[PDB]
Amino acid sequence: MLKAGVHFGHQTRYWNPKMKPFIFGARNKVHIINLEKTVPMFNEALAELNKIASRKGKILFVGTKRAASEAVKDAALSCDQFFVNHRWLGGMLTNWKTVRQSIKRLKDLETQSQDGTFDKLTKKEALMRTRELEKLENSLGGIKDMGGLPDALFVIDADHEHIAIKEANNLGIPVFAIVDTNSDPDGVDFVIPGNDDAIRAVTLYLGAVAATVREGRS
Amino acid sequence: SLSTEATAKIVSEFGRDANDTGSTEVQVALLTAQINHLQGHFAEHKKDHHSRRGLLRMVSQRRKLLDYLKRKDVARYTQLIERLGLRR
Amino acid sequence: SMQDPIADMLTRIRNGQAANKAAVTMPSSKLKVAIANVLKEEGFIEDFKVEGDTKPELELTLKYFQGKAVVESIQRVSRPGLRIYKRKDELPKVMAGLGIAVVSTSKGVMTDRAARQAGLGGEIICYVA
RNA sequence: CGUAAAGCGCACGCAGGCGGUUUGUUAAGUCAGAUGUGAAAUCCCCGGGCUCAACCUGGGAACUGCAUCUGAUACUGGCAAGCUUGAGUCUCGUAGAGGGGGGUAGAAUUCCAGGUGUAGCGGUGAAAUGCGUAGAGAUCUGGAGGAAUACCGGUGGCGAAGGCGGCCCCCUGGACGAAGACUGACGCUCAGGUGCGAAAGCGUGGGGAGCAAACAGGAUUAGAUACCCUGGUAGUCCACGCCGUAAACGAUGUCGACUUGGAGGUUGUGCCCUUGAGGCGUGGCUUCCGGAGCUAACGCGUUAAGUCGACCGCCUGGGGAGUA
Ligand SMILES: [Mg+2]
Ligand SMILES: [Mg+2]
Ligand SMILES: [Mg+2]
Ligand SMILES: [Mg+2]
Ligand SMILES: [Mg+2]
Ligand SMILES: [Mg+2]
Ligand SMILES: [Mg+2]
Ligand SMILES: [Mg+2]
Ligand SMILES: [Mg+2]
Ligand SMILES: [Mg+2]
Ligand SMILES: [Mg+2]
Ligand SMILES: [Mg+2]
Ligand SMILES: [Mg+2]
Ligand SMILES: [Mg+2]
Ligand SMILES: [Mg+2]
Ligand SMILES: [Mg+2]
Ligand SMILES: [Mg+2]
Ligand SMILES: [Mg+2]
Ligand SMILES: [Mg+2]
Ligand SMILES: [Mg+2]
Ligand SMILES: [Mg+2]
Ligand SMILES: [Mg+2]
């Protein structure tokens, strides 16, 4: 039933025909996602994530879309998990070897930021170092303490994070996605039909997934 | 094309009854009436190739209908031939 | 114009199968029903039904085992332009026994396996694999 | 067989090929068995003898074919009777540069006559040929004649293709939509055959303003049988007759069925208070983008170059040659 609030889908004609089974369709030329259909799938996905969390694996929230980013740095960051709230640089997963050096550089500069060399040499070299540091922080943040490939991915949007989904499929990593009417399934192992634009709705998804992952191995 | 009054006259005079516009005799009679009427039009002008293509379609349709009737019921095929004046 | 209704039935199945349709629908006929019956008993389709009386309509329910379809390839053999008849000893077998060849024998439509057991040949309607 | 060679320029159509759906009958095709025949050798499968092998040899199998007899009746064919979904007829309307004939209107170019007025006009990259003091060019008035129809105008419309634009009348072809009635497979394709078929070209008789092959002169150039300039004949126009060809192209034959979507144009129609130019549907044609699939790739993609069926046309390395 309507456990959610009032989002009733999104999008209009930019609709992917593969979403037909999940569409209700009605008011003022806007597609209405069939909430009755998503509730069982959403619960089924929540259960699988709970199973993975009990196994103590990673889930990799990604919500590059602003107005959804911080909500992964919110209590979504709480759980001992990892996120990518900014541009997903191509190759973050399919070549972990090269990005390994980038995180190593990030780690070294974080230490230097408080204990090492941060004041020596001209203020100009100080400010470039800091702005370079924050560039690494916001580009690859929570992912810093990962140290290996994940065990699952959680994507707020599918057609907007297609690069991440494709890399996961290439490496055989399960993918759980919130697919809108405009988005494309078949790259996702567990589809969750639901609006991915509304701030209220996306928080609802992140809270529910956050809550089920709070319960780790127990 | 044939006038509404003219069309009704042939239909009632060749069909088994009124509103029997589909019978082969009615169809052949209607084509024959229009083919004969157009002979005057093409005697004059004589260069209206685009309209003559419509006339040839009438001739071809009538030939096919007549062939079907001859194969189906010879007796009706004949009686129609003399009534309308067609050679073969 | 419509020259080969049987090939029409076969391609309707093929296209609907590739489009992931749940069921396909078509005008009915004795021969179509006989062929559909053989497909059902061989496990290539779920079921079939006929409706209406003056214009009977035949509907087939297609089968999927996994994400992919069940009827891998369905091909017409004896077509109106060239009809194929085989003796008992020349009956073909598709992909080495796997899959069937629908054959219309003097005792009705049946598979190549069934016809070979009954010891009589006939017209090769189609191949299914 | 879009671009590598290959869809006839387009139609109509005889022979031919193929053909919706139900019942009965026949048993020609088809299928089953049997009989006769299918020479021997050879080839193939099972032993010996030449010491082995080659070679010789016993028996079988095979000779895939033909004829006859006896059966089977699903499919194809024949015959008889049906059915309405393919095809067609009727009723009422809609849009359209569809076609043939006749009439007529306005703008403009040229020419002829006259007026006013005076030294240039025209042309080019620059010039010159050319026109002008015998009065041009410019400007105004009157008249003659031919050709084409600004704006509307629109990947707009119509036509089988070629193609078809002022307005009016006459004769005439097709397409589409609403609802109902009618016939009852009457269908699709089509070698040969027949018809239509841009422009140029040809014959006879007219007409002739503008434009303009050929031709003439002036330029450019090393040359310039050209590009540029000034003139200009056939032709372009009309009637009748011939020609039968084009990058006649969507470089894509016709017909039928099936297969996710998005945005437009144009033309019908049903219902809902039109309660303005609205809302919900349902047909025809048409443009652009794209999914699966297909493709060498480019790209095509419900108007397929996707998945299929029927028939036709055509290709088999380049040149010689679409020539003798
Ligand atoms: Mg008519
Ligand atoms: Mg070429
Ligand atoms: Mg070529
Ligand atoms: Mg063509
Ligand atoms: Mg034809
Ligand atoms: Mg039949
Ligand atoms: Mg027989
Ligand atoms: Mg012998
Ligand atoms: Mg021996
Ligand atoms: Mg021997
Ligand atoms: Mg029969
Ligand atoms: Mg010919
Ligand atoms: Mg000409
Ligand atoms: Mg002449
Ligand atoms: Mg002359
Ligand atoms: Mg000149
Ligand atoms: Mg040619
Ligand atoms: Mg052309
Ligand atoms: Mg063109
Ligand atoms: Mg050609
Ligand atoms: Mg396209
Ligand atoms: Mg020649």
JSON list of N, CA and C (backbone and C1' of nucleotides) in Angstrom, two decimals, chain A residues 13 15 17 20, chain D residues 260-263:
[
{"chain": "A", "resi": 13, "resn": "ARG", "atom": "N", "xyz": [6.86, 11.81, -21.22]},
{"chain": "A", "resi": 13, "resn": "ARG", "atom": "CA", "xyz": [6.84, 11.11, -22.51]},
{"chain": "A", "resi": 13, "resn": "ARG", "atom": "C", "xyz": [8.23, 10.65, -22.76]},
{"chain": "A", "resi": 15, "resn": "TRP", "atom": "N", "xyz": [9.64, 8.52, -21.71]},
{"chain": "A", "resi": 15, "resn": "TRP", "atom": "CA", "xyz": [9.53, 7.30, -20.93]},
{"chain": "A", "resi": 15, "resn": "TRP", "atom": "C", "xyz": [10.15, 6.14, -21.69]},
{"chain": "A", "resi": 17, "resn": "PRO", "atom": "N", "xyz": [10.23, 2.52, -22.93]},
{"chain": "A", "resi": 17, "resn": "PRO", "atom": "CA", "xyz": [9.17, 1.51, -23.09]},
{"chain": "A", "resi": 17, "resn": "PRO", "atom": "C", "xyz": [9.37, 0.28, -22.22]},
{"chain": "A", "resi": 20, "resn": "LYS", "atom": "N", "xyz": [7.01, -0.29, -19.02]},
{"chain": "A", "resi": 20, "resn": "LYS", "atom": "CA", "xyz": [5.56, -0.47, -19.11]},
{"chain": "A", "resi": 20, "resn": "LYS", "atom": "C", "xyz": [4.98, -1.29, -17.96]},
{"chain": "D", "resi": 260, "resn": "U", "atom": "P", "xyz": [5.24, -5.28, -30.46]},
{"chain": "D", "resi": 260, "resn": "U", "atom": "O5'", "xyz": [5.62, -3.75, -30.71]},
{"chain": "D", "resi": 260, "resn": "U", "atom": "C5'", "xyz": [6.96, -3.30, -30.67]},
{"chain": "D", "resi": 260, "resn": "U", "atom": "C4'", "xyz": [7.37, -2.84, -29.29]},
{"chain": "D", "resi": 260, "resn": "U", "atom": "C3'", "xyz": [6.88, -1.47, -28.85]},
{"chain": "D", "resi": 260, "resn": "U", "atom": "O3'", "xyz": [5.54, -1.46, -28.39]},
{"chain": "D", "resi": 260, "resn": "U", "atom": "C1'", "xyz": [9.17, -1.67, -28.36]},
{"chain": "D", "resi": 261, "resn": "G", "atom": "P", "xyz": [4.77, -0.07, -28.20]},
{"chain": "D", "resi": 261, "resn": "G", "atom": "O5'", "xyz": [5.92, 1.01, -28.03]},
{"chain": "D", "resi": 261, "resn": "G", "atom": "C5'", "xyz": [5.65, 2.40, -28.20]},
{"chain": "D", "resi": 261, "resn": "G", "atom": "C4'", "xyz": [6.81, 3.27, -27.79]},
{"chain": "D", "resi": 261, "resn": "G", "atom": "C3'", "xyz": [6.64, 4.75, -28.05]},
{"chain": "D", "resi": 261, "resn": "G", "atom": "O3'", "xyz": [5.87, 5.41, -27.06]},
{"chain": "D", "resi": 261, "resn": "G", "atom": "C1'", "xyz": [8.75, 4.07, -28.83]},
{"chain": "D", "resi": 262, "resn": "G", "atom": "P", "xyz": [5.02, 6.71, -27.45]},
{"chain": "D", "resi": 262, "resn": "G", "atom": "O5'", "xyz": [6.13, 7.79, -27.82]},
{"chain": "D", "resi": 262, "resn": "G", "atom": "C5'", "xyz": [7.01, 8.29, -26.83]},
{"chain": "D", "resi": 262, "resn": "G", "atom": "C4'", "xyz": [7.88, 9.39, -27.36]},
{"chain": "D", "resi": 262, "resn": "G", "atom": "C3'", "xyz": [7.18, 10.49, -28.13]},
{"chain": "D", "resi": 262, "resn": "G", "atom": "O3'", "xyz": [6.52, 11.43, -27.31]},
{"chain": "D", "resi": 262, "resn": "G", "atom": "C1'", "xyz": [9.11, 9.83, -29.31]},
{"chain": "D", "resi": 263, "resn": "A", "atom": "P", "xyz": [5.27, 12.25, -27.88]},
{"chain": "D", "resi": 263, "resn": "A", "atom": "O5'", "xyz": [5.94, 13.29, -28.89]},
{"chain": "D", "resi": 263, "resn": "A", "atom": "C5'", "xyz": [6.93, 14.19, -28.44]},
{"chain": "D", "resi": 263, "resn": "A", "atom": "C4'", "xyz": [7.46, 15.03, -29.58]},
{"chain": "D", "resi": 263, "resn": "A", "atom": "C3'", "xyz": [6.41, 15.69, -30.44]},
{"chain": "D", "resi": 263, "resn": "A", "atom": "O3'", "xyz": [5.87, 16.86, -29.86]},
{"chain": "D", "resi": 263, "resn": "A", "atom": "C1'", "xyz": [8.04, 14.69, -31.82]}
]
